[model samples]
Target: IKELHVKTVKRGENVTMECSMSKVTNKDNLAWYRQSFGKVPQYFVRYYSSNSGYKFAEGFKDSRFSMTVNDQKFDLNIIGAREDDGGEYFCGEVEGIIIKFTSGTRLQF
Candidate 1:
């Protein structure tokens, strides 16, 4: 499903951005992305399986971004989100070589 969902939140609030990848069961091949309107997509983190930890990209090492593991749901959570944390968030699946998303969400502050 190539669709986008938007979420509006106030400053210092907790936010959860989600995507549904029900078709992708068993070993999860998931990733989170942050991409604004004009820029190329920025890689946030990658969660390959339920037994593995998140493989974070260069600028996403902080603890503010964490994901809730579910059977088929991909969710990126923000803890007391910062002012500049607002962006277009993507919850996608990694197909070995390419990055394909189930859906996308916008986190607004």
Candidate 2:
């Protein structure tokens, strides 16, 4: 079995997250979701093998979300976090439209 890791990020001027994976497969899929006040977690991205740069899903293209896949870690980035960015974000694998959160990082303003 593969161990999945998720991370939410916040920083003064920039934020970053690193998710670790134990095993890799040809179909290793990753998705990101966002949670905010009075809002259900929303889909951020759907990664495909042919992806070039950060592939973001619908509803996450607000210039505040980004993800990068590395060897065993998936890196998430948020630029210039604001008070409204407070909440929780998750990154993990996906099946259909369901995402199994691996780990989470909370943000506070």
Candidate 3:
């Protein structure tokens, strides 16, 4: 688990996090979070595994959320990064140790 420092994307621009892990054979489930003041990072979406047809986790199924599996990698994308999108975003699990993006991404318009 490691922190991700992403550059700021312009308004209407795009940003992506290819959270991948192949060390273990099990399909790794990933979670997305947005950090803000006082409030904890908001839970976004989840991704399933390959080979088998499994659904992503709960509390992460939104219209804005999507999952695409390539080989052993899972790519998570947030189409538009608005001003409010400027902050810390992470990809990890629901329980146990959570991975934090070492640096936050700032969206500028």
Candidate 4:
């Protein structure tokens, strides 16, 4: 799938990372993760589709991070983006044995 290379966002500007769940049957398992450098991927958020409310993982809970979805398009959002937010952000589908992920985007400040 076509993907973004580096998305530069000014501090306080909002940025969105667009991905898809076209190949996935259940959209509930779709989520996003962030990886900076060689560290482990941090679970960002997950959506239930029912209420369309994106839920953040333990330490990931923040008012600035959010998501939007319509049909197969699922997008991640960062409001009033910060320098620490820059990293490799990717959307994923957790399907038991295997996982599906977007090519990912390098969000830069």
Q: Could you tell me every candidate's TM-score relative to the true structure? A: 0.78, 0.69, 0.59, 0.84
Ranking by TM-score: 4, 1, 2, 3
Model number with the top TM-score: 4
Cα lDDT, model 4, residue 20: 75
Give the per-residue lDDT of model 1 (tens digit) for 1-109.
5667878888888988876657764334677888866789877877655454456787556787787766655677888878688679887777777867777787776
lDDT values for all models: 0.73, 0.63, 0.53, 0.79
Compared to the true structure, candidate 1 yields what TM-score? 0.78
> Could you give candidate 4's per-residue lDDT for residues 21-88 as a string of tens digits?
67776777888888887789887787674676567887755788777877766888888999988789
**lDDT tens digits by residue: candidate 2, 1-109:** 3333333444556777555555433335666677887899876665556554356775444677666665565767778877777777676776566655666667665
Q: Locate the minimum summed-lDDT window of 10 residues in model 3.
A: 100-109
Residue range 10-103, candidate 3, lDDT tens digits: 7777666565545423444455566664567775654554453234446544444355566665555567656665666565554446453322
- Candidate No. with top lDDT: 4
Candidate 1: worst-modelled 10 consecutive residues by lDDT: 19-28
Clashes in predicted model 2: 2
What is candidate 4's CA lDDT for residue 105?
88
**Which residue runs of candidate 4 sit more than 4 Å off their true CA positions?**
1-4
Better of 1 and 2 by lDDT: 1
What lDDT would candidate 3 get against the real structure? 0.53
What TM value does model 2 have? 0.69
